[PDB]
Structure formats: structure tokens, C-alpha cells
Amino acid sequence: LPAIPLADVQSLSYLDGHLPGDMGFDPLHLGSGVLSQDWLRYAEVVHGRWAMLGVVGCLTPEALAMRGTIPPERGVEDNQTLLIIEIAVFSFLESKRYEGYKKTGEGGFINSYPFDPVGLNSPKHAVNELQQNGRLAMLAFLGFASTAAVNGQGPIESLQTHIADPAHNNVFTSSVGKESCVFVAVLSILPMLIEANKALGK
Amino acid sequence: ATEGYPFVPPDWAPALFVPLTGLVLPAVGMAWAFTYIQK
């Protein structure tokens, strides 16, 4: 909580900073319930897990020469029946995770094993570094998804083009997104408006 | 779009905006209004 998102922003009253990743940013008051924010937090961390694994899941195949840069299932060895066993094994695993989460919270385990500290590592800083890296990968995966604007260019390949020309190869001009300028415009003026509103309403 | 950006809307615009303000918006509006009417 002392860091704060833009310059000096009054941190929300509900966020006392008790949570390890309280950057002080939480707009529209989506989470303010005591029992609801804990579950939302569990969602955010589970998201980061799937997304971090995802970011490095596309990074490996993309770096080397292979197929599926944009579309998966070029061949494979199991069709449709595979998908059924996928949902079955995941349903059993997920039911165990939900049962474990209800008992202690911050469910970090594989199958049915309440706490999973195999490596014996679990300090506070590692809890925090999990969150910050998950937030980063959740915001990086969208750029991997944003390959649509860049079309055939892949994640590693989009980086290569941007290296060749740093001014005519960006979202602001080389992409079809001309509204990105308006996004950064309103994202730049929004802070000042919050400070302005709160200041005026003395 | 192209040379028309200033308020030029994509093709599936009424197919996703009319199903929104005609069912989702009056439902959330009436729900919030009913909870505000009662104590």
C-alpha cells in the first residue's frame, strides 16, 4: 500500500494494505466485502498460475521452429475422446482443490494435498513474487493474443520487427489501432480528474 | 476503420447493443431500483 499507482492517490478505505499485493488501485469498488475479496484473491492467483504457465507455454514453441504459432492441433494422436478425458481428470482435480481451499485458503497443491511445499520454500517474499509475476504474465498473454492486429507475426517475431524499425512498428502507428492514442490519452488525464474531484469536494 | 475512425462502428454493432439495452440493461436497472425502493 505505500507505493500507490499514479503519483499520490488516496488508497481506498476498504484496502488497508493487509493484502501483500495492495498497489492501492481498486476503481469501481468491485471488491469490498471481507469474505468476497479473499475468494477474488484466490481467483487472481489461480489466474496468474494458468497465465504464467501459458506465457512460457507459447514462448517455448514460438522460439524454436514449429507449427501452431497461431493455431493449435496440427495433427495430434487423440481426437474428441481426448477432450472428454481432459474434462474428467480436471473435474476430479478441481473438486479436490475447492475442498482444500475452503479449509485453509490460498490453495496451492496438486490433487488432494492441502499444502504443497515440496521444495520447502514458502516465505512472504515468495508469496508476493508469485502475485507480481502472475500479474505481469496476465498482462503479457494479452499481447500474445494481440497478434491478431499484427496478423501473421508471432510473439517472438513481433518483437523482431519492432527491433528493425522502432518508430513505424508499434501499436500507435503500425497497427490498425488508432484508438490506442485515445486510450493512453484518457488513461493519462484520468488521474488528474480523480485528484481534481477529490480536491474540489473538500 | 480506414479514414473514418471518428465514431465509425463495427458491423456486429446492433446485434450486440440492442440484446444489451433491451434485456440486460432494464434487468439490472429494475433490480437496483427494487432493492433501492425496499429497505
Binding site: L200, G201, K202 | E3, G4, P6, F7, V8, P9, P14, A15, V18, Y36, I37, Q38, K39
Partner: protein
């Protein structure tokens, strides 16, 4: 104890449905809210004003956006006579196969509806020619709407809320409104007319990228700073001149040509600039009349105190009227509504006779829809003016302040005023109905010669005095030796005479014996509505049947069934009764307008002139003949574009009939019925588990009158709008 009516603890402590309904009724009566002071009242009004401005600008921005996205504006500019304007697109999952095939009009890929607002001609006249200019201007209007919303919130904050004297300052308000809002805005508009509208009408493209490099006039301000101001009117646009290109164009900007344009049938664009410029100079020079914080100007209180005739004509004159007007809000609201309602009708009467937009006279549905819309709006605003006058007399009229003045003096002979209004209304009603029934019976006995036909020798005389040489009155402006004809003979009289002598436009239509009776019907409706409203306003604070009416408020049910019965005795009830008469009067004036133009547009002007004298002729040739294509919107042989109008034509009838229910049936019958339903829900199995949070009760007496009037007015409006647009759109363009 609930918390929804935050402004009223009395309604907040109501254990019935009456709390909900009333919670939506007194939401804007800031003068009767719990714990409200004069300063708080004025500040709340100042905020709601900004909210209204923001929603107005947002609405017009949305109109520009929809026409720029789905309207065929670029296709309409290249051919403003054949193609039809497009309002917006239609997306309905309820539509069938034939509805999608039949709703596609105007050269579109999907189903759309033609626009009757007439904004295409307005934008094409002011200068908008591309589909992008509407886009950029729509985002500009949305931006200014956002600023107004911020301004309203900004002023609702401490150290930013204006004081009471700032609101109670009329001298600087009138000075700034007459100089800046009315004059500077008009000067900026004539600047746009001379810099963009005039060159765009002559093919010269002028936009934000080249308006600083193109001079509006060849001379270039050189005559404005020199004694040669007539240089701006050297070569006007000739007759053979196209409105899109420079074929036959001119270089003049501030001309003075009477009449219209030979191709667009509208006023010369080089004349509206001159008009707005003269109006701007007049308003700016008139805005320096009152005294602000300087050593010059006038004082409104001093002028009002000095305006008192001697020999006791008005007694105290206008003494105390300044404090009476400035201290009250309903007086200012009634005056503003009266002025706005009068100028709205003025706008309606001048737009059809003198069309100001290019290719507007060709569009027959646009003119009818615009005239009907402006006249109905004017009628509702005119009823509101008298309603607020009655509210003023009840809420803020203290008799001890203005003793013996004109306001207290007109109240002394309210019986004389009301009685003379009653006599005028009875005279017009008896005679107009008698002449119509006499002509009807005589026409029904197979003898049309016997019917009485009065030629309006007064309005025909006015038309002959203004230029029309059809009647034969050798008077001024129609002669050749009158001083008024020689005056202006070289200024605007040739164009004005050429436009008034043509029998194809709408400028001073040829009247006859059929317009005499209709004009008398219009006079009857006006005097009757004025009688109801004036009687409800003067007898608002007391009567001989109820002298303490002022102690009961403005909208009460009655004062029991005693003393004969006092049903509908409040001034609210009087206004309620006057709404019906206002609707009838506006219906009569619009029926007259639509039939005269409906017979003029089809070259059968002799149909209305000989079939408008009897009411059976009205019902046959107007309501029955022009409704052949409207009801044929959907039959067992399919449907067409008019089917939507046919559907809403019946939808209006259903709303009207539902209003008759709330008007005829009264609350007690319904109260007993609701009680029986309560017993039913309480003693029923498997449904007694649920229960109402608020006790169900019948609507109140005042609420029942309001809902019935709303249903009556909505049906009356929807049915006529459907018939007008369908009957005009169905057989014309």
C-alpha cells in the same frame, strides 16, 4: 420505515404503494422538500439546468452519429429530390422474412426507416456535405455535453456554490443574455454563414483546413473599414443557379432579396447572413441598457416604479411588481413559458410559409411532420405557462406587498374577466357549430346553393394589402403609385411580389369561404382554453364555494361531498380540464393545415375549397379518403413499409381507450376490488408463502386524473402522428 423518498419523511413513512408512485411525482418540487431553504432551492435549480443542457447536447450528438453511420447523406447530397432521407437502421429478431424484404428503402443493404425530422435539408443548407463532418461534429457535441455535466457537478460543491444575490441579479443577467447569448452568438452565426455556408453553396469547399486561406469576399474587409458597405451586395446569385456547383453563382454576401431561390424554393442564403448580422448588431446594442456595476445603465425597479399613469388609471401602477417578480420563481417560469410557447408557434407558422432549408418544399412528409410537431409542442408549453401562473398565485403571492397595483387590481374584477371570456366562448361555439350544421343539413337535402358561405373580406384585404393581386383590392403594396410600393421597389419588393403571386408555394395561400369557418373554430378553441386556464388561475386562491382554497395547496382531490360536492375544485383540476381543450384546439389547427396542404400538393385545390364547408365532407374526404393506404399496412395478402405506421395507428387507439378507463371509473370501486384480491392472496395455498413488502392500494384521485390524462394525450399524439406520416409518406415523397 423505508428510505426511498429521501426528500420527504412523510412519504417515507407510508406503508403502501402510494409511497412509490408519489416518490416519482414530487421528485422535482424542490419548493416542498424536507428542510429546504431559498439558497438551497436556487442552487438545486442551477444544477438541474446544467443536467438538462447536457442531455440536450447528448441527444443532438446521437442524432448526428446515427445519420452518419446508417443514413445515406452522401447519396442524398448528389440527388436531393429523388432519394429519401434515412433515420437509422432497424435490428429486430421479431421481424420475419417479408418484414426484412419490405423495410429496405433508400438504397440500403438492410432494413431502415425514412426520417421525417428534416435534418438532412438543414445540414445540407448549413454546409455539411460529407459523411465525416457529421462524425467529427458529433464527437464535438458529445465533448461539450460532457463539459456541461462536469459544470453542473462543479457548482454543487462548497466554495463554488453561488450565493442568493447572484441568483437575484437581473441587471447583469439581462445585459449578458442580450449581449452575449443573443447577440455574440448571432454574430458568430452570421460569421459562419459568410465563411462556410455561403462558399459551400457555390461549390467552393471551405473547411477547417482552408478557411484561413480563402477570403469570403473579393474586396476582403476593405469596405467594412471604408465608406463602401454596399460592396458586399454587388452581384447576387442569379436565377439560373445550381445550389451545388458554381454555375451561375455570384460574389455578394450581404444582400437583401425578397422571395425565394428558383431551384431550392428556400430563402436566399445570402439573405440569412444579412439578417443574422442586423439582428446581432441590434441585440448587442440593446444589451447595454441596464445598469451593472458601472456608472451608466438603467434600473428595472426604477422603470417599474416610474411606470404609473396619472389620473388613477391603474391605481398604484406597477409598484411592488419588481419585488413580486424577482422574489417569485413561478412568475418568471410562467412568463418564460408564455414567451417560449408563443415563439414556438411563430416558428411553426413561419417555417411552412417561408421555407428556410434547401429542397424542403419538395419533401412533403417533412413539412407536415415539422409543422405538426412544433404546433403540439407549443400547445403543451402554453398550457404550462398558465399552470405556473396559478401556482404563483397560490404559493408566492403576498397581497400586502403589492396593494392596489395592477396585479392586485386585476384580481378585483376576476368575475368580470371570467364572465366576458365565457360570453366570447359561447358566441363562437354557438355560431360556428350552427353554421356548420346548417351547411351540413342543407347539403344533405340535395341543395348546396342554400348553404351559407361567408367570404373572409378582412384576411383577403390583408393579403391584397401585402401584395397578392388575386382578390382585386387596389391598395398599397399591390398598386403602382402607393408610397409603400415605390419604397422598396428596388430593395426587396420584386422578389417578394414574385414569391407571393405564385399559386404553387405556401406563402400566403389563397383563402375562401372554407377557411372562414375553420378560422372561427380556431378562435373558439383558443378562447375556451384561455377561459379554463384563466379561471383556474384567478380563482385559485379562493372562491365563494371554498374561500380557504389557498390553505389547501395547489393539487388536492376535493373538499368532501358536502356543500353540494366539490369534485375537481383545485387549480390542478382546472389545468387537467384545460389539457383536453388544448388537445382539441391543436387537433383542429393541424387538421386544417394538413387538409389545405394535402389538397394543394396534389393539384386539387378545388376539392377542399368546395368540400370543407360541411362536417360530413370533412369526415369523408379527409378522415376516410386519406386513410385508405394506412389501414392497408398489413392485410391477409401480405404487408408493406406502411405496416409499422398501421400498427402504431392502432396502438394509439388502444392507449386512448385505456385512458378513458382512468377518466370514467373513480377510486372507491377499485379500492373494494383490491381488498377482495388481498383476501384471495392471503387465504390461498402454496402462494401464501410470499407476501408484499408494501400494502397494495388503489391509485389516488389526483394520480388517477394524471394517469388518465397521460394515456389520453399519448393516444391522441400517436394516432395522429401515424396517420399524418402514413397518409403523406404513403401517397407522396
Amino acid at each position: 420505515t423505508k428510505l426511498f423518498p429521501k426528500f420527504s419523511q412523510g412519504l417515507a413513512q407510508d406503508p403502501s404503494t402510494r409511497r412509490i408512485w408519489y416518490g416519482l411525482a414530487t421528485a422535482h418540487d424542490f419548493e416542498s422538500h424536507d428542510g429546504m431553504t431559498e439558497e438551497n432551492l436556487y442552487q438545486k435549480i442551477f444544477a438541474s439546468h446544467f443536467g438538462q443542457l447536457a442531455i440536450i447536447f447528448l441527444w443532438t450528438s446521437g442524432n448526428l452519429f446515427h445519420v452518419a453511420w446508417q443514413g445515406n447523406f452522401e447519396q442524398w447530397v448528389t440527388d436531393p429530390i429523388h432519394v429519401r432521407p434515412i433515420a437509422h437502421a432497424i435490428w429486430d429478431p421479431h421481424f420475419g422474412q417479408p418484414a426484412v424484404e419490405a423495410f429496405t428503402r433508400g438504397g440500403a443493404s438492410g432494413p431502415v426507416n425514412i426520417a421525417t425530422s428534416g435534418v438532412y435539408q438543414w445540414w445540407y443548407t448549413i454546409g455539411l456535405r460529407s459523411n465525416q463532418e457529421l462524425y467529427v461534429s458529433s464527437v464535438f457535441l458529445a465533448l461539450v455535453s460532457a463539459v456541461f455535466l462536469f459544470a453542473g457537478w462543479l457548482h454543487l460543491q462548497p466554495n463554488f456554490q453561488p450565493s442568493l444575490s447572484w441568483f437575484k441579479d437581473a441587471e447583469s443577467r439581462l445585459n449578458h443574455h442580450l449581449a452575449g447569448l443573443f447577440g455574440v452568438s448571432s454574430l458568430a452565426w452570421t460569421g459562419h454563414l459568410v465563411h462556410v455556408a455561403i462558399p459551400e453553396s457555390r461549390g467552393q469547399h471551405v473547411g477547417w483546413d482552408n478557411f484561413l486561406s480563402v477570403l469570403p469576399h473579393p474586396q476582403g474587409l476593405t469596405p467594412f473599414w471604408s465608406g463602401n458597405w454596399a460592396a458586399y451586395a454587388q452581384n447576387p446569385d442569379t436565377a439560373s443557379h445550381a445550389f451545388g456547383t458554381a454555375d451561375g453563382s455570384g460574389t455578394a454576401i450581404l444582400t437583401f432579396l425578397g422571395g425565394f431561390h428558383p431551384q431550392t424554393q428556400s430563402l436566399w442564403l445570402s439573405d440569412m447572413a444579412h439578417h443574422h448580422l442586423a439582428i446581432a448588431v441590434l441585440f448587442i446594442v440593446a444589451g447595454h441598457m441596464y445598469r451593472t456595476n458601472f456608472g451608466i445603465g438603467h434600473r428595472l425597479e426604477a422603470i417599474l416604479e416610474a411606470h404609473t399613469p396619472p389620473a388613477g388609471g391603474l391605481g398604484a401602477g406597477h409598484k411592488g411588481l419588481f419585488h413580486t417578480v424577482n422574489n417569485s420563481l413561478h412568475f418568471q417560469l410562467g412568463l418564460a413559458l408564455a414567451s417560449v410557447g408563443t415563439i414556438t408557434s411563430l416558428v411553426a407558422q413561419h417555417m411552412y410559409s417561408l421555407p428556410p432549408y434547401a429542397y424542403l418544399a419538395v419533401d412533403f412528409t417533412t413539412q407536415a411532420s415539422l409543422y405538426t410537431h412544433h404546433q403540439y409542442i407549443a400547445g403543451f408549453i402554453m398550457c404550462g405557462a398558465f399552470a405556473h401562473g396559478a401556482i404563483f398565485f397560490i404559493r408566492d403571492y403576498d397581497p400586502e406587498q403589492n396593494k392596489g397595483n395592477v396585479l392586485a387590481r386585476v384580481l378585483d374584477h376576476k368575475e368580470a374577466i371570467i364572465s366576458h371570456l365565457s360570453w366570447v366562448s359561447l358566441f363562437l361555439g354557438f355560431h360556428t357549430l350552427g353554421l356548420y350544421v346548417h351547411n351540413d343539413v342543407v347539403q344533405a337535402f340535395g341543395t348546396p346553393e342554400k348553404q351559407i358561405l361567408i367570404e373572409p373580406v378582412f384576411a383577403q384585404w390583408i393579403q391584397a394589402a401585402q401584395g397578392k393581386s388575386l382578390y382585386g383590392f387596389d391598395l398599397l403594396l399591390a398598386s403602382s403609385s402607393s408610397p409603400a410600393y415605390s419604397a422598396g421597389q428596388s430593395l426587396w419588393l420584386p422578389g417578394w411580389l414574385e414569391a407571393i403571386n405564385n399559386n404553387q408555394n405556401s406563402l400566403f395561400l389563397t383563402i375562401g369561404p372554407g377557411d372562414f369557418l375553420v378560422h372561427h373554430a380556431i378562435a373558439l378553441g383558443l378562447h375556451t382554453t384561455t377561459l379554463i386556464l384563466v379561471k383556474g388561475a384567478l380563482d385559485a386562491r379562493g372562491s365563494k364555494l371554498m374561500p380557504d382554497k389557498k390553505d389547501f395547496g395547489y393539487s388536492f382531490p376535493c373538499d368532501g361531498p358536502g356543500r353540494g360536492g366539490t369534485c375537481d375544485i383545485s387549480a390542478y383540476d382546472a389545468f387537467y380540464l384545460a389539457v383536453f381543450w388544448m388537445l382539441n384546439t391543436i387537433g383542429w389547427v393541424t387538421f386544417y393545415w394538413h387538409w389545405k396542404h394535402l389538397t394543394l400538393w396534389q393539384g386539387n385545390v378545388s376539392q377542399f375549397d368546395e368540400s370543407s364547408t360541411y362536417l360530413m365532407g370533412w369526415l369523408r374526404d379527409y378522415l376516410w379518403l386519406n386513410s385508405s393506404q394506412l389501414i392497408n399496412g398489413y392485410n391477409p395478402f401480405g404487408m408493406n413499409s406502411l405496416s409499422v405506421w398501421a400498427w402504431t395507428f392502432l396502438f394509439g387507439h388502444l392507449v386512448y381507450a385505456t385512458g378513458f378507463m382512468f377518466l370514467i371509473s373513480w377510486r372507491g370501486y377499485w379500492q373494494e376490488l383490491i381488498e377482495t384480491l388481498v383476501w384471495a392472496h392471503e387465504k390461498t395455498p402454496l402462494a401464501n408463502l410470499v407476501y408484499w413488502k408494501d400494502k397494495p392500494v388503489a391509485l389516488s384521485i389526483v394520480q388517477a386524473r394524471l394517469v388518465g390524462l397521460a394515456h389520453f394525450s399519448v393516444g391522441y399524439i400517436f394516432t395522429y402522428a401515424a396517420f399524418l406520416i402514413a397518409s403523406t409518406a404513403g401517397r407522396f415523397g
